[PDB]
Write a protein that binds this ligand. Sequence first.
Ligand SMILES: COC(=O)[C@@H](NC(=O)[C@@H](NC(=O)CC[C@H](O)[C@H](Cc1ccccc1)NC(=O)[C@H](C)NC(=O)[C@H](C)N)C(C)C)C(C)C
Lengths: 99, 99
Amino acid sequence: PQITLWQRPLVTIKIGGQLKEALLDTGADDTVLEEMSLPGRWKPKMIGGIGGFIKVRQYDQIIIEICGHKAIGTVLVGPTPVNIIGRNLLTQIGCTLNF
Amino acid sequence: PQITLWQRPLVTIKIGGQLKEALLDTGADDTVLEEMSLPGRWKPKMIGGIGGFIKVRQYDQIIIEICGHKAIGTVLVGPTPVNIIGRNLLTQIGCTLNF
Ligand SMILES: COC(=O)[C@@H](NC(=O)[C@@H](NC(=O)CC[C@H](O)[C@H](Cc1ccccc1)NC(=O)[C@H](C)NC(=O)[C@H](C)N)C(C)C)C(C)C
């Protein structure tokens, strides 16, 4: 679909048997989600942003459905203020910037 | 032009007689530039991100040329790690997200 940018570009994801809202972010290399119940094993890691660096928990291989398309990748669950889908999953569903 | 997202979507801006590179960011409401030489007057303000909140200086009315299109808005100069062009200028040159 074409999304214009007069409002925050928010979308619905299914991940974990659970539904949430995420912001399509073209200036995020990683997908960071606020604290949620996910199973398996994971590594510690650290992500940078504006005003900070946070400690997050790295999960690989996840089932993420983003606006009905499926994808599989690395999801970092940690203390973000908003769910962020970043450039590792965005390429997988084909999003592009055009102006 | 169509930008695909396998690399960070970076573009050239002319602001202040000076040339720089900025990331087109759909998850940033405000345009935040790292510290640069701009004239006039401005207010203190504070912006949030991942990992924190920062104090920035707010200028209104600026001449920003982003990839050959012109635009005029509020630019926040402060301690970002990278130059961010946000949703207030991005609508003015027409960018859209499509997938
Ligand atoms: C190792 O990876 C690094 O740590 C690199 N980081 C990145 O690429 C990271 N991207 C980023 O860090 C880029 C910034 C994001 O796109 C955030 C998203 C946000 C909006 C609202 C609330 C909270 C967050 N926007 C903002 O911080 C903007 C300036 N803030 C605002 O618009 C506020 C809410 N009014 C991602 C990990 C998220 C860094 C070198 C650029």
